[PDB]
């Protein structure tokens, strides 16, 4: 999924050789990498959102 999302992004960079000066498609790809990179970090740092009534309480 994550590798599949940008797999087609390596298709547009090949498509970008004939189309030079793309204002926002790369930015949209940049945006879809900026938020997605924020996704993996968010879930990996995400502890189980709970207070351990057994131990931590």
């Amino acid at each position: 999924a994550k590798s599949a999302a940008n797999k087609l992004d390596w298709a547009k960079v090949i498509s970008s050789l004939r189309i030079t000066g793309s204002t926002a498609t790369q930015l949209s790809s940049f945006k879809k990498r900026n938020d997605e990179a924020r996704r993996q970090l968010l879930e990996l740092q995400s502890q189980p959102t709970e207070v351990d009534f057994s131990h931590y309480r």
Binding site: S15, I19, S22, T23, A24, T25, L27, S28
Partner: protein, 85 residues
């Protein structure tokens, strides 16, 4: 703010470019052009058609016709310079 879309906008972009001006030019220059030397009209038949095929064609294009012209004057010896001025 969104996914920009200039990959597919050539339907109206293929009119202003310089090669398109040449494109619409030479394609008209090609369709009607005769394929393999067709319609050359090599059989010339007009009055002195024989002359048109020996020297008047231009394959030789030498001093023979003026030689023929000179011989015509020679054959007219007793018509212009003799029996007359």
């Amino acid at each position: 703010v969104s996914t920009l879309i200039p990959p597919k906008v050539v339907s109206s972009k293929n009119i202003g470019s310089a090669p398109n001006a040449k494109r619409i030019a030479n394609v008209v220059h090609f369709y009607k052009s005769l394929p393999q030397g067709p319609a050359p009209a090599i059989k010339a038949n007009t009055r002195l058609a024989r002359y048109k095929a020996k020297y008047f064609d231009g394959d030789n294009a030498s001093g023979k016709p003026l030689w023929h012209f000179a011989l015509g004057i020679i054959a007219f010896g007793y018509s212009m310079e003799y029996y007359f001025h």
